[PDB]
C-alpha cells in the first residue's frame, strides 16, 4: 500500500493534538502547545482487499515551531500510537 | 497550489542526485554519495499560469537518510536546492 495525499481537516487535527499529547508525555521539548496542522498532510494504507492500518507523516504546529510526527493508527480497533516526533523542521 | 505523490522513477533518480550532487558544493556533510530515493516523493505545483514546482525528496547518501527540498521554475527551468536536512528518520 502507498502514499497518498490527504486533507486537513477535522480528523487530520484530532491526528495533531494526539501526536503533541503523545509528546508531552515524553518531554523531549518540554511542554508544547497544539497549534494546527499544516498542509501536506499523508496517509498510508496498510492492507480481495481489506485495510490493516494507517500510517500518518504530519507536519504540525505546536508553541509556534513546525514538528513531523508520524502516527500509526490500528484499523479494526483505532487505537494510535506515535511512531515519531521530529523537529523542529522547516516547511516541506 | 496543491501537493502530490508522484512514481519513484528516472525523473525522481535524478532530482535524488541532482539533491546530493548541490549538497556536495555547500559541503555540510562532507562528500555524500547517493544511494537511493526512498518513497515517497512530494510534488507542489505553483500557480502565479504555473509559476514553478517544488519537490520534497528522502535520499539515502552515505548510508544516511536526508529530507531535501528542490525548486523548479516553470519559465527558466532552473532547479535549486532549497534545502537539505537530516539524518532524518524514515517517513
Redesign the interface.
Known sequence: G????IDIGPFTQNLGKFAVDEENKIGQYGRLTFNKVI??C?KKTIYFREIKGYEY?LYVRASDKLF?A?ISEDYKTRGRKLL?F?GP??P?
Open positions: 502507498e502514499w497518498e495525499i498542509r501536506p499523508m507523516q513531523r508520524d515519531r521530529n523542521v522547516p516541506p
